[PDB]
Ligand binder design. Sequence first.
Ligand code: MSS
Ligand code: MSS
Ligand SMILES: [Cl-]
Ligand SMILES: [Cl-]
Lengths: 378, 378
Amino acid sequence: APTADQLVKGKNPKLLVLSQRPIVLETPYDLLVSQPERTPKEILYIRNNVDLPGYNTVEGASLDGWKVEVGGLVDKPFTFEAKELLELPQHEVTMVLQCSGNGRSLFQPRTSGNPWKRGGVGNVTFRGVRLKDLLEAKGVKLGEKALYITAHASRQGNAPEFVRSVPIHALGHALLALSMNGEPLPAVHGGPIRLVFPGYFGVNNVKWVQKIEFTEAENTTAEQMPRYRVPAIPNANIPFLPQEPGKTYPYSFTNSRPNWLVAINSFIFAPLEGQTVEGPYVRVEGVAFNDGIVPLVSVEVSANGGRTWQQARLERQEKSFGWVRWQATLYLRPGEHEVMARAWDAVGRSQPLDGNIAWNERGYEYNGVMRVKFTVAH
Amino acid sequence: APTADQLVKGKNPKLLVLSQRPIVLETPYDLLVSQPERTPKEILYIRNNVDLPGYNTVEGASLDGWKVEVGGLVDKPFTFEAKELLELPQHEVTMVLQCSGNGRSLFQPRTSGNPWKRGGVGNVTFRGVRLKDLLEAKGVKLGEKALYITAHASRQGNAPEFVRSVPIHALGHALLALSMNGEPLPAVHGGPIRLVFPGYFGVNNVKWVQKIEFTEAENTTAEQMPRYRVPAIPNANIPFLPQEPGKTYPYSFTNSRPNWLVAINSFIFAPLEGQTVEGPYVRVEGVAFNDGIVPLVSVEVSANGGRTWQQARLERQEKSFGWVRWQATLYLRPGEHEVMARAWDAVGRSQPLDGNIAWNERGYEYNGVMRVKFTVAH
Ligand code: MSS
Ligand code: MSS
Ligand SMILES: [Cl-]
Ligand SMILES: [Cl-]
């Protein structure tokens, strides 16, 4: 019966243990909602596909000796020591770090993989050096065929490979993170250095980064294809191509797309499922987010199954990779009620009313409208 | 001052003349709304990029002698005469036929191209033989590398080429149309044979089809790249990548996507702009559509600038390539009012509140929330 504190030094003992090898921990929802500004390292979810031996602590790690290779389609490949980043211009970013498998357990029938509820997400601040700023300092130029950034994790400890490719558009905000929430990046969260892509699913934010290559194509590792993909019509304007629930799909590069941009979403933080609340005026609160490319336009709530939707008040109006808090105050008579929340962004993206339309066999990118049932009292 | 009836035999004289060579005609909105079930050939918009000499009539054309080549990545290329289709299984489809430039004039600043309002759309029924059913009858199998259908218009009359590529997924519903709205396909609408792709923008539905090739890549004609594209992150889940309005974009195959799937939309048919209507109860009516891959979930209307949204009643609930009629009845006090409509489909797609976020220099795929201002009387 090993608890989270025993698997990972400094983790809150209440974290749900989804897997021991590799280490997978989920934040209980009540704990997640207690930190609506920023998710602390004590409770932040963990998902290792590949464990790095000795990295199972929230303590920072040493930069000493850590070398990163940069190459591929650049005019002048080079190697740098992580410590050299301390002298370069630094940037900070608050972003939603969300597992592509977050919400997996809401798909029916059951899919393959760690059975997340909604606790495979956090809102965190990374600080470090932008990849573009490093290239600039080193006097390096990208080739015309550089269409992807392909990042490889350390193989120290005889670890298996972990290699992800994201579109070259990600170079705009790509960050070599040395710090998280103002402290040394925790070892277990990729310290001493992690390549982060704001507004991309967690899988892409490569912990313990050792090599960065600019490539003309997606890498052909198993972690790029067939895993961490959903059925799609490539380069057509549909979020995914729906499939029969429960059926195996023959994933290829040409019939599916990677888990890249964080799917637009909204979580209801109050009230909680099954809670009793009082009076007629019921303040519904939560957070909402997208991939940070454009602002949210609205978060809307309905207590009548979608017959009418009421605009919530959002605490910030600018675009952001971090979540945005919202509230909507509703007049409700005593009794059982159900509230749902829906986000809507400036380019028209929103959430499916029934998230199960997105059923896929490894259970990625769930973003169905969240519903909460509770009781209103006198 | 040549009117539409003089440019194209059998067209309603009230059609707006956007261009004489090539021929471009737009349906006035009042006429469009008068036909909420099916748009007749007398009023249906015309957009030729490339005129076919002598095809400027709503009359049907002869199938005699019309040969179509089918080849590329198929095991057994072949040629067929259009008349052979008369003996094969036939299918009909009602679909929104919409110019990718429809709505172009709502972009600010002005973009390049024919200045459509909203009359570059119709709802029509095509009948003919499915491309897949033809391949089956001929005992032909697609190669494993067939990722696109590339269709070429007739060059008769020494006409310039017109070549479009759509994803092989389109093979599911691709139709060799011989009839429109129950009559011989009008010459000016591509008679005697047009390759139609339900739920794809009009540009893709190749009139006077003479060659169909299954190809591994998009064709490299000017009509495929750089035209009929919008900025994008290829194979990422965002409908388009927003750009600064008024700025020229360096279109390539790797930074933009074609005008393929019809963008989700909703049009308000009643009331009309500037109209006075009576009593407190105001019935708002219109149509809505997507690319037909999934059903619409709702059409919603707001008369308070989006503070509250009310679900309309849709006349049909199943998915469709054709538009779906809706109505929402609102209680409104006397005075000036503004109503807006928003569609929402099962995969979460919706419309941008401000359609100008999609500004692109050739003015494609406008689908901003439609607003109508009118007066309520006592
Ligand atoms: N190196 C590395 N990195 C990496 C990995 C591994 O395994 N390795 N994983 C992923 C995932 S998958 Mo699904 O999309 S989520 C996720 C993330 C997590 O984070 P944290 O653990 O820190 O929270 O990470 C990311 N990155
Ligand atoms: N062959 C051909 N086809 C074709 C063409 C040309 O020019 N040619 N155009 C386009 C377009 S461009 Mo924009 O996306 S719209 C459109 C359409 C139209 O139809 P109608 O004329 O029938 O209505 O067609 C289509 N197809
Ligand atoms: Cl997982
Ligand atoms: Cl046009």
